[PDB]
Amino acid sequence: MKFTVEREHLLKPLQQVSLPILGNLLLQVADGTLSLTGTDLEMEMVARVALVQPHEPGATTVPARKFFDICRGLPEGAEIAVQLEGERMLVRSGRSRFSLSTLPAADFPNLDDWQSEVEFTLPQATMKRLIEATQFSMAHQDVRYYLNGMLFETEGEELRTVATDGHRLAVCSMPIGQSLPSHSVIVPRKGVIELMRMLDGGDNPLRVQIGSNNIRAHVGDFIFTSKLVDGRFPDYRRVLPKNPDKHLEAGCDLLKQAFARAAILSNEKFRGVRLYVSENQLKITANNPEQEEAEEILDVTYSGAEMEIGFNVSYVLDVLNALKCENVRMMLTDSVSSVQIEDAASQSAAYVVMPMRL
Amino acid sequence: MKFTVEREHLLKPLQQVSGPLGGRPTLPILGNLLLQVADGTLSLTGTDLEMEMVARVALVQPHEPGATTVPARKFFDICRGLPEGAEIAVQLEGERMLVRSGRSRFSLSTLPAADFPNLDDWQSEVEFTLPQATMKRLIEATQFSMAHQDVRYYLNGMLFETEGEELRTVATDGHRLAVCSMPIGQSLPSHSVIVPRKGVIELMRMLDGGDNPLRVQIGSNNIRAHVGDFIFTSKLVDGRFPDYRRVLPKNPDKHLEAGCDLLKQAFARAAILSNEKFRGVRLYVSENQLKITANNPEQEEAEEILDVTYSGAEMEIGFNVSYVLDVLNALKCENVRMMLTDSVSSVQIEDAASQSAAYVVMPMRL
Ligand SMILES: CC(C)CCC(=O)N[C@@H](Cc1ccccc1)C(=O)O
Ligand SMILES: [Ca+2]
Ligand SMILES: [Ca+2]
Ligand SMILES: [Ca+2]
Ligand SMILES: [Ca+2]
Ligand SMILES: [Cl-]
């Protein structure tokens, strides 16, 4: 295996792809192409680079971080020459020389072959919107493994994401402009994070392939694959309040800043605030073990019956930070029922949050 | 005690005087700021018992005198969290201090101003003014070489030395040393004092970057710095710092000069394949050439060849590459001079264009 390539052409590929052998990148030269693969057994990223300079086919594996750091550490405009010599891989550029250890390409974990069942293309921006709208509501290390991740659901012409931790839920639906089969899978949180990471903000569309046990995403000359998670993910439709009769509308940023200020004097371990809704007004209060008190009064749009209800501060701020909008609607039922929160100008996403007793 | 101040006039003072406060204040009052209204000025003070930072805020709105202490983090977060240009009205009510702005209201627990720790009065024995940039240069040139939580307590601070028309800082951890001298244009008596770790941090923190000069006062047991409307005071560390003059190699007759960035980037790349704990690289110096090598127990190898200026005898010497990189990062210059003796002796490293800063690094046993 031998190739010479500009550092420039390796930088982005290495960034995306980076048991001892799982700390190594697979390098493969074949058919005028260098392929680079990184994996952790649960997911893999493959990147390809074209090779115009003389090259020789073959494959080996090398320490991912060290190889990346060496390539990154070389000067801008550097040419990187690589040749395989037994148990070492030689890397040369200018008068900088490196010998890295290797493990055989034959030993490299190959994620089992699988079969695509559902396929579609969508804009990068749509995937970004879907993930950012809901990712914060995924569970972290819940014993219910299937909540430590994100539901991806196809229905009609929409792709939908759902995330929940049992206390709050986020759902977002976006058009993809193709009639799609009804289907849903759970992508583990680490997979969701890497999927987000591969979206660079340009116009490259994403090609998605969903199998019975895997999901794959193609963008540019990168291919990402992740295993899926087994489980009965809850139905968001059953979580949405059936008949909210009390409607508050307020400035998103005004509400966010009032919550954030009040939270300063809430209990440090379980930060919550009490809301009192009455005619044209929201009052937010907090107190702590030291008997310190905060109070915020806001002029709001509200005409239903008076009620008091508590919320976990972080759950509400998480939603308001996700909304990034002018006005927010809160749809309430009673003091012991969950609340629905939405951007007043968008029906693409909805949030449900349990009340908190204080 | 009463005052009303616009938000943005409080924020930076609050941030500044909170400098010395830790997370986990050992006792409640140490997490509080002293607020004092007197003679048309609000003063803010934070302390950790070793040093204090004080800010003076002019009061253009109606006020009443008095003093209390309140939780620093809560009070700052409240002020920061209010809308831009918010008028922050404060009224003391015994065990509580009330804060109001628009329709936002807050009640904070207080502790008596009379219990707030107050550094003893002391007497200045030397005073001088210097540009903020000069103090910045002095600290940045040497701070990285200070020890971290060493049982030899004096090493955890920074020596400040006045001598003739020069102010000098020195830092060392026993393995490597940094010294920087700068001119002040005022003839100073000889003083040598150790500023504690957090004190060095605060001195740096208070340099706004503008043209407000720094006024320094040093006593036998304290140091004080005045910048704008801030006054920083620290107790000095009670120890005898090593003399840097005795640590500088006596006659290194082997001189190497090379570009700083090329040397840095080569050391940085070589470091990748050095031992993860010991970080050893080897330097082979020969006529007009430096070869840097690293290897690790994975029997991986790095080699960097650099054109340098060197006329001395060939020699091989090992170094902790982190120590070398730290120096090169601190020098931030075009060319560097390395002054060598032998493979069992320290190297002296300097900007090739200025002797104002010098660095002494002990070699590694190969
Ligand atoms: C977010 C919260 C208001 C959902 C409460 C709820 O409807 N829980 C159901 C479904 C569910 C939702 C989220 C996680 C797990 C289960 C249950 O406990 O069975
Ligand atoms: Ca090329
Ligand atoms: Ca991977
Ligand atoms: Ca459905
Ligand atoms: Ca104002
Ligand atoms: Cl003011």
Label this structure with key terms.
homodimer, 358 residues, alpha+beta, DNA Polymerase III, Chain A, domain 2, 3 domains, eight-stranded antiparallel sheet, seven-stranded antiparallel sheet, 23 strands, binds N-(4-methylpentanoyl)-L-phenylalanine, binds calcium ion, binds chloride ion, Beta sliding clamp (chain A), DNA_clamp_sf (chain A)
Give the CATH superfamily of the largest domain in chain A. Answer: DNA Polymerase III, subunit A, domain 2
Backbone structural class of chain A? alpha+beta
Q: Briefly, what CATH class of the largest domain in chain A? A: Alpha Beta
Helix proportion of residues of chain A, in percent?
10-25%
Tally of extended strands of chain A? Answer: 23
Q: Main β-sheet of chain A: number of strands, strand sense, barrel status?
A: 8 strands, antiparallel
The end-to-end span of chain A amounts to: 66 Å
Number of domains of chain A: 3
Q: Work out the oligomeric state of the chains in this entry.
A: homodimer
Instruction: Spell out the helices and strands of chain A N to C.
Output: EHEEEEHEEEEHEEHEEEEHEEEEEHEEE
Our estimate of the beta-strand percent of chain A is: over 45%
- Based on CA atoms alone, the radius of gyration of chain A comes out at 25 Å
Subcellular location (chain B): Cytoplasm
Family (chain B): Belongs to the beta sliding clamp family.
Region (2) (chain B): 129-243
InterPro entries (chain B): DNA_clamp_sf, DNA_polIII_beta, DNA_polIII_beta_C, DNA_polIII_beta_cen, DNA_polIII_beta_N
